[PDB]
Amino acid sequence: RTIVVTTILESPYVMYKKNHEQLEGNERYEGYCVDLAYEIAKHVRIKYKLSIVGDGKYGARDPETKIWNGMVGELVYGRADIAVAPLTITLVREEVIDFSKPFMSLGISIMIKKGTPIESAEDLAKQTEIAYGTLASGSTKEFFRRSKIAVYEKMWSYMKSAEPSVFTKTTADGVARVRKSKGKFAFLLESTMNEYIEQRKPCDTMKVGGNLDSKGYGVATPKGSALGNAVNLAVLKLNEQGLLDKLKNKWWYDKGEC
Amino acid sequence: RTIVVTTILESPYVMYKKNHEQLEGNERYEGYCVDLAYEIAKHVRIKYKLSIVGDGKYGARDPETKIWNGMVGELVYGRADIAVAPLTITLVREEVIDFSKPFMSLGISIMIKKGTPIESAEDLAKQTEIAYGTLASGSTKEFFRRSKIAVYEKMWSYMKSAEPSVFTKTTADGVARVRKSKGKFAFLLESTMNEYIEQRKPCDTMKVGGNLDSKGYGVATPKGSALGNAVNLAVLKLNEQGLLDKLKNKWWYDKGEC
Ligand SMILES: N[C@@H](CCC(=O)O)C(=O)O
Ligand SMILES: N[C@@H](CCC(=O)O)C(=O)O
Ligand SMILES: [Zn+2]
Numbered sequence: 472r473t474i475v476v477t478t479i480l481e482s483p484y485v486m487y488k489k490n491h492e493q494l495e496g497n498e499r500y501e502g503y504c505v506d507l508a509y510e511i512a513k514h515v516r517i518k519y520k521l522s523i524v525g526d527g528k529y530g531a532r533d534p535e536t537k538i539w540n541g542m543v544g545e546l547v548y549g550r551a552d553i554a555v556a557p558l559t560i561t562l563v564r565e566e567v568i569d570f571s572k573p574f575m576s577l578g579i580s581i582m583i584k585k586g587t588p589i590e591s592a593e594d595l596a597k598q599t600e601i602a603y604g605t606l607a608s609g610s611t612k613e614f615f616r617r618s619k620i621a622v623y624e625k626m627w628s629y630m631k632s633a634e635p636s637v638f639t640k641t642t643a644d645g646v647a648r649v650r651k652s653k654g655k656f657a658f659l660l661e662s663t664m665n666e667y668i669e670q671r672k673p674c675d676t677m678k679v680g681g682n683l684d685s686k687g688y689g690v691a692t693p694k695g696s697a698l699g700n701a702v703n704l705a706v707l708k709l710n711e712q713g714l715l716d717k718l719k720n721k722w723w724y725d726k727g728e729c
Numbered sequence: 730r731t732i733v734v735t736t737i738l739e740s741p742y743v744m745y746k747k748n749h750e751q752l753e754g755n756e757r758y759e760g761y762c763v764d765l766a767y768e769i770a771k772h773v774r775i776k777y778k779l780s781i782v783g784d785g786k787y788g789a790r791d792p793e794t795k796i797w798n799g800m801v802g803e804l805v806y807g808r809a810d811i812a813v814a815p816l817t818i819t820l821v822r823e824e825v826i827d828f829s830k831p832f833m834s835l836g837i838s839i840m841i842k843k844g845t846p847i848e849s850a851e852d853l854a855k856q857t858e859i860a861y862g863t864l865a866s867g868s869t870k871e872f873f874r875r876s877k878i879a880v881y882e883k884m885w886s887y888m889k890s891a892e893p894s895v896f897t898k899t900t901a902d903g904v905a906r907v908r909k910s911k912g913k914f915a916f917l918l919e920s921t922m923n924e925y926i927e928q929r930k931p932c933d934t935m936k937v938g939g940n941l942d943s944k945g946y947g948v949a950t951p952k953g954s955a956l957g958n959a960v961n962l963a964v965l966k967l968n969e970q971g972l973l974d975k976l977k978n979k980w981w982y983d984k985g986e987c
């Protein structure tokens with residue numbers, strides 16, 4: 472009777488509490504998505520157990536074995552019932568799983584160390600002094616791999632061959648690299664993560680330029696799940712009653728440090 | 730399958746949320762006891778529904794009809810399964826219901842408007858310029874009614890006959906009366922409520938002297954309930970893991986205004 476909710480350790484969506492060692496189950500974790508999962512489960516009327524995705528990935532299909540990994544894989548293969556995470560709504564995923572209407576809007580964005588002479592993707596593409604990269608897996612990397620726009624094709628060509636590799640395993644690693652590189656590394660990531668980091672000490676990063684696209688995160692379920700409808704209606708209610716905005720303020724801005 | 734939890738509207742234990750009009754069920758309320766009920770239900774493993782006691786009372790037995798009113802009555806007559814509230818552990822109640830070990834320690838205390846020339850119960854008892862009273866019903870009034878200590882007998886004799894009546898219907902009314910009386914009214918109430926008000930604007934009240942007694946609030950259940958053991962063990966765990974102290978800080982001090 473207990474619904475398995477897959478999620479991913481990513482600040483400020485899901486994080487361990489300070490004393491998690493003496494805590495069990497859902498209590499171990501806190502964050503925006505922990506709060507959102509509680510709200511969904513309240514309104515859908517289900518008991519639930521949070522489960523951190525074993526492989527720490529969002530979800531992509533292996534071109535060789537055709538196997539889905541990450542949170543998407545957990546849903547595809549029936550190991551989880553719902554995903555509550557900053558999981559981007561994309562065509563290739565919508566082909567295999569279902570998504571609620573968006574609970575958060577975002578776009579791909581550029582993170583620089585303050586003072587770096589870059590104001591747009593065009594600025595990055597036309598030079599080589601400042602390296603740039605994305606998460607080693609995820610919808611951002613796929614944006615560049617799949618683009619047919621000249622500027623982004625140029626960026627993908629550079630990123631694919633750059634050494635040392637410009638691809639990072641986690642968002643935190645990419646951020647660390649921006650901070651430690653004296654302005655010679657810029658990180659391509661979602662505007663939501665960018666905005667969060669901008670409000671954290673040492674306050675040495677910034678989001679520059681407009682977003683490169685417009686999309687959203689959705690709460691995901693397996694195709695044909697009997698929970699899809701109620702989850703979607705819950706998300707819409709939470710939006711219209713101002714909860715989603717409240718939670719965004721709680722985890723991004725109310726706690727700000729800059 | 731849903732356990733009925735009786736409680737009482739008393740700040741900061743239980744209060745309506747700003748938007749309660751668009752909210753249903755437990756979501757309507759917030760406060761220390763709302764948080765405590767959630768924690769108890771999590772650890773005891775039950776679904777639950779908060780229910781504000783209809784008559785707004787804590788619990789006393791009518792000397793005429795022998796009927797128990799308030800939250801105690803809800804438990805005695807089977808209309809609620811648990812009470813989570815600032816309900817004082819007393820002999821006469823322990824005769825009819827069960828209580829967990831204390832989740833909060835307290836004592837009877839004196840609230841004055843700042844500048845009032847009173848430092849103890851003795852100071853109040855020996856004069857008449859400054860009126861004083863208690864909640865019109867509850868364990869504090871019963872303390873004075875039942876005492877055989879000369880000072881408290883003197884106070885009860887005064888309070889019983891004073892006009893205009895010195896007894897108030899709610900804690901809030903007693904507080905208002907202290908604030909509006911230019912130092913000519915002092916209010917006898919539990920140290921917990923006193924400490925809370927002391928940290929609220931206009932910051933014009935204070936707790937004076939030591940406490941008159943030492944007791945505790947407990948989570949209550951009907952005699953012989955199958956939930957009594959697990960509730961008691963939950964309360965002890967919450968105490969030992971520092972949750973109770975955290976919640977006290979959250980609702981009394983972290984939000985302070987003085
Ligand atoms: N939200 C992305 C992960 C982060 C990124 O790609 O930058 C996804 O669902 O794959
Ligand atoms: N906690 C008290 C109510 C407040 C008071 O008596 O001052 C009771 O359980 O009756
Ligand atoms: Zn750990």
Ligand SMILES: [Zn+2]
Binds near residue numbers: 513756
């Ligand atoms: Zn809600």
Ligand SMILES: [Zn+2]
Binds near residue numbers: 749750
């Ligand atoms: Zn109302």
Ligand SMILES: [Zn+2]
Binds near residue numbers: 768771772972
């Ligand atoms: Zn707990």
